[PDB]
Amino acid sequence: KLSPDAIPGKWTSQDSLLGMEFSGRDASGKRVMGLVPAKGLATSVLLSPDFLWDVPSNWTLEEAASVPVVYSTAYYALVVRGRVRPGETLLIHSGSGGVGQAAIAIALSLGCRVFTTVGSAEKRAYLQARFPQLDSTSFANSRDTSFEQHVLWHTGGKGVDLVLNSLAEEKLQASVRCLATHGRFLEIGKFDLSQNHPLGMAIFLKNVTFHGVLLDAFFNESSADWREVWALVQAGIRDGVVRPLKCTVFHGAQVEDAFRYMAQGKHIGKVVVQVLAEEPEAVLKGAKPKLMSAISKTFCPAHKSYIIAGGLGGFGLELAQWLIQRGVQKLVLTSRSGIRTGYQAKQVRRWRRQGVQVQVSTSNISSLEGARGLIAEAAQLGPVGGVFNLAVVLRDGLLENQTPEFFQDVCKPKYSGTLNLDRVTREACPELDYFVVFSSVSCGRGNAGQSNYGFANSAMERICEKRRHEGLPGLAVQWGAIGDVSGTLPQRMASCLEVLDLFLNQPHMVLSSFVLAE
């Protein structure tokens, strides 16, 4: 229902944005609960210390997983933005939810009379049990506009001072009419705001401060203003106002069960996922989390240098971008000509802006001296991580009109270049983790008039197979027709990159991929 890009901050993952809060141990062994923009559902999280609280001695790690998001948003909305003062009256929609419970806890500490809206009698009973200060006249219905009448009656028709709204459409319109003079409206929902629904400006005649509350802005900006909320939450923890919520724990394997349980919407409190059980000891100073088997995909270290031969080519530019999204930051493209089109210039400018250290080379991999120079440049950047060979020179035509010069021209980049790369790698590249050559099904299946192309591609496969017989990395991918940049339909670039991600982990030497026609 929510587009992945709607999350603030450029991620480019298009996935793994799940998770905002966590409770676990630290790099030193200290119990900590944190708040992260995304990627909270993992066995490890990389976070700055500004977004971590210590877990007091009474609390268990399970309880701590419920505090961060809800209490941070509650404090930010009420104290930091709404500037609540003792004795006020406020309407907290959806009291049973996490943010509603946090707001009630913060308000009841100040002495404010509270109206809350709930969707069932079980939630009403749960909130009555949780907060005995609440009376029988502090509950309305959250599935209809009947709370407007309830509040305008039990408040004498004056209204409420703060309205922490999470409801949308008519219920949001109904909540505005509950405001009193000098009231404040705290909008923590995002449906009406996204749709740009109109808000009648008459309500502002009686002094009304309509707020837009978004906690996400802190996680990627405004660090100076975050410390106020952090300190407020810390003070609440020490004073006892911040109380953990009910937890419905699910194990790491049954995360889908947790997601379906949340989808049904019958939960009261917070839903937690137990990645790893808590040890009795206060500080464990442990080494690593317990190993769990998971789908393997390709990621690259930041300190390694990568080489793409013929990288200014349409597949080569697209492979480079794919690598950059996987953490590559030291890249060495090679081309006989150089940057000679607007597309290449745009891409390289963008990558250099993003901080990646792109470097273009004219070193021709065919000549052994050229290969050694290319590896020397890569080493200058950093230890050589991978070597990709996407170079191609085509001289098509039936065998009747071929010449030895054409075969040499076609085989110089693919055969000779691959041999020289292999030799220089076996000599002076001890950290190499990838070695890929891009071939064509014309080698395997066969095609008419591409005899020299087929000879050039096939020789690459032999070298890759020999390399994998000595333990060194090697791989050859037999593609069909690349689409965006035989009887086979052209294969889209996205599908190609997905398949390639699949291939880099397999144990085999030569692989293939194509799309059959009709």
Partner: protein, 68 residues
Amino acid sequence: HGLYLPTRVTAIHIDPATHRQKLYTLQDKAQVADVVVSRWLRVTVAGGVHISGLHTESAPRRQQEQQV
């Protein structure tokens, strides 16, 4: 990244006369109009048209995945 499609526009102006006056023919027989996009001011002005306050929302990919 991803295909963003228009969802709102705040103001569009079309003045056909100024449009016909702005067009200048290239060395070929083709008629062309120069375009400028100001992401600071939120105006896309080209020829005799003036788009202001465009908004585009991400649309989910159809995942028809016709290629297997």
